[PDB]
From a paper:
Here we show that components of a (PUL) from Bacteroides caccae have activities consistent with comprising a unique pathway for depolymerization of chondroitin sulfate, a common GAG. After prior desulfation by an endo-sulfatase, BcSulf, to produce unsulfated chondroitin from chondroitin sulfate, the depolymerization pathway begins with the activity of a polysaccharide lyase from family 35, BcPL35. BcPL35 activity is coupled with BcGH88, an exo-β-uronyl hydrolase, and presumably BcGH109, a confirmed α/β-N-acetylgalactosaminidase. The most unique feature of the pathway is a β-D-glucuronate dehydratase, BcGDH, which we show through structural and functional analyses primes saturated non-reducing end β-D-glucuronate residues for hydrolysis by BcGH88.
BcGDH is a member of a large family previously classified as glycoside hydrolase family 154. Instead, the evidence using chondrosine as a mimic of the natural substrate clearly supports that this enzyme, which we refer to as BcGDH, is a β-D-glucuronic acid dehydratase that converts the terminal β-1,4-linked GlcA into a terminal Δ4,5-unsaturated uronic acid and, therefore, renders the sugar a substrate for BcGH88. We solved the X-ray crystal structure of BcGDH and refined it in the spacegroup P21 to 2.25 Å resolution. The resulting structure comprised a well-organized tetramer in the asymmetric unit that is predicted by PISA analysis to be stable in solution. The structure shows a pronounced slot on the surface of each monomer that is slightly tilted toward the center of the tetramer (circled region). An analysis of the surface residues of BcGDH for conservation in the family revealed the residues in the slot to be highly conserved and likely to comprise the active site. Residues on the surfaces making up the quaternary structure interfaces were not conserved, possibly indicating different, or lacking, quaternary structures among other family members. Based on this analysis, we chose to make alanine mutations of 10 residues in the putative active site (E74 A, R78 A, N176 A, N177 A, W178 A, F181 A, Y229 A, R285 A, Y289 A, and Y354 A) and assay them for activity. None of the mutants had activity when using up to 10 mM chondrosine, despite displaying thermal stability similar to the unmutated enzyme. None of the structures display an active site architecture consistent with typical glycoside hydrolase activity (i.e., potential acid/base or nucleophilic side chains in appropriate proximity to the substrate glycosidic bond).
Numbering used by the authors:
A (entry chain B): 38 to 423
B (entry chain A): 1 to 385
C (entry chain D): 39 to 423
D (entry chain C): 40 to 423
Write the structure that this text describes.
Amino acid sequence: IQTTGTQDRAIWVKLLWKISYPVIHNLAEGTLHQNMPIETRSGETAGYKDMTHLEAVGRTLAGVAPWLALPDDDTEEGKLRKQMREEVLKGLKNAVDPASPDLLNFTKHAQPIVDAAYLVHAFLRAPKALWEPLDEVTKERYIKSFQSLRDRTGAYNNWLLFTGLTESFLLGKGVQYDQFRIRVSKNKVKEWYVGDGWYSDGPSFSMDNYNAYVMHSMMVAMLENLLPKRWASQKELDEAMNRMIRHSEFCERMIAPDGTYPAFGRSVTYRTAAFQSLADVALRKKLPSHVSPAQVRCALTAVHRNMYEGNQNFDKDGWLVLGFNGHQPECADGYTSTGSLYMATLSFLPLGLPADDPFWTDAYADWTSKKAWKGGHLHKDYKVEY
Amino acid sequence: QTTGTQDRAIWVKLLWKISYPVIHNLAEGTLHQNMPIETRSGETAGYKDMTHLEAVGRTLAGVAPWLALPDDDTEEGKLRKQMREEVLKGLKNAVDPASPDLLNFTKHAQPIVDAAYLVHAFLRAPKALWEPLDEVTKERYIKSFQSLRDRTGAYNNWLLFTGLTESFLLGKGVQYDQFRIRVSKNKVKEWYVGDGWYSDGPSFSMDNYNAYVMHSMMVAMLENLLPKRWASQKELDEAMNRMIRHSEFCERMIAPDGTYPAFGRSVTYRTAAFQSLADVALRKKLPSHVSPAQVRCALTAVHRNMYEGNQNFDKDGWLVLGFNGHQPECADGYTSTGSLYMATLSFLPLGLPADDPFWTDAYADWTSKKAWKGGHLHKDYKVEY
Amino acid sequence: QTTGTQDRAIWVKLLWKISYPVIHNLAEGTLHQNMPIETRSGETAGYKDMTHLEAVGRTLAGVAPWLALPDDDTEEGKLRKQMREEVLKGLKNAVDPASPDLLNFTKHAQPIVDAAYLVHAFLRAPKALWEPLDEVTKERYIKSFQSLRDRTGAYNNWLLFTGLTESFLLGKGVQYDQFRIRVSKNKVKEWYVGDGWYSDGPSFSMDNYNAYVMHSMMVAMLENLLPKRWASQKELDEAMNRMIRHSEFCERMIAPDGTYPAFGRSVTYRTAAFQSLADVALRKKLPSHVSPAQVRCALTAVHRNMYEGNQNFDKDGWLVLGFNGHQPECADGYTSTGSLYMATLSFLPLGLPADDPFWTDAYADWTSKKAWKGGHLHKDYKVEY
Amino acid sequence: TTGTQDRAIWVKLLWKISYPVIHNLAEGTLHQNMPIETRSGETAGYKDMTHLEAVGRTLAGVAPWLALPDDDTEEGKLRKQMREEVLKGLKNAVDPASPDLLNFTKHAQPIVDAAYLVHAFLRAPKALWEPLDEVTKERYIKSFQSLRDRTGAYNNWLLFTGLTESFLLGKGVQYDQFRIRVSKNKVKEWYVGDGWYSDGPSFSMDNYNAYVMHSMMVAMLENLLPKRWASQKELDEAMNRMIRHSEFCERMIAPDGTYPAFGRSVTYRTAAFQSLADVALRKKLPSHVSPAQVRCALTAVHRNMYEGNQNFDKDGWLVLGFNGHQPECADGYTSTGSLYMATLSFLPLGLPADDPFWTDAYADWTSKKAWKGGHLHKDYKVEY
């Protein structure tokens, strides 16, 4: 029994709302610090307290932004989009308001480097919906907030993209940016490419979801910012773009016939963020020839329902819990807390395609593994050299 | 749920279902007369020169551990006894100049690959499959392996094929190629990219060839090199630990429904995707948070999902081109019927005896099966070695 | 042949000849007024914004060790105190916003390079050249160094300039850029290719830039990071031994006639090609088969062949574009008069006191001078660290 | 001086080096008469390998000169005399009855010097290979094929077996495809930049880029090209890397005609200039480096090293050292036969006497110009 693309879209909307609205509405009401849980594996909240809310806000907005970039209309979904966008804009104003209880932390610890970069990515996926409407004083505060990060740093790995993307955003805004951060993060990430659509997360190859969590989406987004200033070439952007496209094939292929996907590597608590590269490629209308938009929609539909339709991944008040499919704090990394979990929005990027795009209107289609395992047509795969 | 005893009888049944047509036909000298030469295009020229050694080498590499067990009086023991005798008969025929089943070693580059799988069979069961051969046949295999040195293939995992063969000749006390051993070992080490993965040649390739070739053969080669001082104990341990780490990903990619993703080239090798998991389990080197029982139960579900029904077999019981079903469109141009017998390579845990904890411990869910129903989920993390 | 004492007086004369015009004009506020701005193209636009910091930073980085010596009233002691007082005066001028010799830190990427050489002077003579500065002047240099963070240059040895500058700021207890230190340290370590050589950026460059920048500044940077646990003692030892190794080649390339090859880019930097040799010598870390006296004597010959005559000097005592002579055809487009004061960087041994054995041991032929006469030639061999 | 006088100096010095090896081999008295000097004084082990070292290393350097057509000049008479003695010694060297039968089967070392012998055959095929009788030809093919049971270091040694197999490929006999494929790919991977390879996994600042890597990579690739074991771009790449490398070697000749002693195997002496001599012979010098200044720089080197007797023993054999008797700088693997690398800087004698390399007016080399205030071409590392 299949669903239609229009039914699938409605499901995604319900599920994305279920994930993100607690974060967005509390931020808008100024009650995010007050109400969000701070669940950690250890149970300690010290330290986590200073960073988890920027984690929730940046990671949530990074995933809902394409949806909120769509032009307004009077349809039912269009009303939901308008409402969430208004609450987001209200929370974004609070988040840098010194009188707001939800003033977010940018000045302390290395962690905000990460989450500022996901916030920046939201601004890049929806400039006209989420950045341009901000009043000038709010805009200037975000500029200074991003510039204040430069006295700290994180690991020698995918973290280079966080500070690289942030500076590339500042460059795109015509404000003062750090050329060193832009240059070394680009070249380093290029040196870390190991083949067949995969980078190493730092000097050693890591078989995990971090290529989807950080590397492809942000390498591409950063290079796009750098092209007009000639800080990167079209060749470099096409290169990173095609490596993301290739990576998305493996990620669509690892969705099983039952709609599950393997749990592997660190930060498994990010759940369907493991599909951000497939979600980004779908949003950009760049799926490879043999991988239909419908089959990606349907594959990610099954995964979305498998992980967010029931309440196994949510607490009594609708917040995400530590775990994978269930309350499983034993798989949370020591650096993870409740706000970290909002990477979960990053598979919902194709809601930034309009409701009349083929991704949402083509008929249901089995995905690769589902075809493979019932004897259907199974396209030949092969590693690439670019 | 089935018991571990029942699981073993299923693996026996399905490993027999796969391997017996190759083994019995070679035993009877009718493998050339009887084995299909299915290709995606349908052409059989060229393929016909190489496909029968593919079937034999790949089949034997996978059944060799089972056939290595000590004999006993059980019903399974009789099956082992019967199969081993037919293998020994086929191996004599395979290098007999007057047998219609004489195998090709001199034409094409492809024999380099499948001689290495046969060598791997000899290495997994030396007392059972090599030593009982008569000396004339042993000498013929020695010369057959040495005659491979005029050709070569791709600059990738293929280097392990010739390194492993040469490490076998070394281990046998006959003349071997030191250059093949020195460069193959060093290049494979240079291709390690991290977290249990090698690049299949200069460029990383997200596929099953780390399982098909690289881990098992690098470990097995270093095992031959070590007593002869062509590798150090630390080099062996390093390759061993890298294979063990790799088997973690492979156990984790078995889904709750017993399936696993179809990705990368040579997907027609089916469950050979699990040779590194199977090699680690046979070696009883599974990390402490991955129970022997969950590996048994995971691979049982995969084995039944791929081999219990007949979707992957033709009317005569031979493997067909595909993944789960008749899917010729996913077969590489280099693949034929004989190539498909990689399918044996997930059955190495039959090389543990019936009373090993792998086969007696109670049923256990595997990693994703637990993860997806809210059960306990061990935290994973990339390693640095 | 000369004695050590006559060699020291020669080096003092020649270092003074090179450096005094820069230092004395800076002290007098007349550096911008009097220093030529000679370029291959003949253009001064752009170059005039940067060429004076180049002059100052490069001159100071090379005279710093000598000025670090304790004071005494010998004829040389008088010269050291005269020059030090004029450096201290010029350094105040260089950041005084009303001084005519105010230096540029904010325009172009080039200040990143020459601020680093000025930092290196401060690192080589902290009690002589940094501590005596007034607090306003100190804070100005701190702010100047931090204002560089909006620019960058080439993806090569330049990473050490910003890495070393930030390591100085860290050592001064002020706000420093951690990202700059982390990636510069790791990238430069990644560019080590072997036998005492780094690649200048991603592709190996057979030129003098290992001496111009990489060894001396890697070591000095790790020295600053060590007490703050931003580098290990193992990392510093590695860099130190790599520089020691590198100096062996540089001492071996001085010919029996006291010349050395002209090769690679920025050949106009003249004896700065021997900075790693000079640095290892000053640190009293020459390998056992290379005596201090043979380094003194080889570098004395080079120093006299390059600086005693006036072939490399214009009518006013400034350095000219060239190698040994007026040779603007070999000057890079990025080079001007100020750039040439890299020539000080081989006089680091003057930072060893006048009774150090480098300056008192009997004359000794250097490696190639012995080799080409039939004398003892120590066996060389590439190293694995 | 004139290039014609220089050329006569090179002929005389090349003969001074090589004629002891060649003449004794043609007489069958090489084993009897050649010393086996070592730093330790031991001769065991060395005695099994050092003679092929002298023959292979000598012939690799004299081969271009002996490829020249015969003519009635005085120099022509010397070439035909030397060539005929080489052909005689070559027959002897694989004659199972000859006292100068060379070892190919014992130790790893013959892998090296068979490659140098192969390089002599590649450098002068019509003069030193074709005239050999068929049975002697057969014996060499077998001797080269018998090397496949042994190997040496994981470094420049790969080129020895690669070049040898490419020779067998070129002769249409049975060859090792694996040796050709891996040696080609490994050496490409060891290229670090600016005309230098690492000698194995770790970069080594020494003369082995000139000793082995450039000339043998290029020669091997030329054999592979027509058989589709290498492409034209691959050959062009290795050629341009050799050409770039010769610039540094030409620049390290000092104004006094010396050059720095550095790195291992320094006892090979002017073989440090094989890549320069090879590019000169190939007439591929970069446009700012005149053939004449190369001729003249190497004449100063060749005289500083070979005109006097500081590098020879009482019987005209090379002795261990650099410039003088300096056995303290010889590696433990080096013996008397090893020293005949010294021929490898003489390749441009393979240009005829009327080539511009030998008739262009005297010119100062790069450092001689630079140090007297002459013109100095701007150098810059390359990216290919």
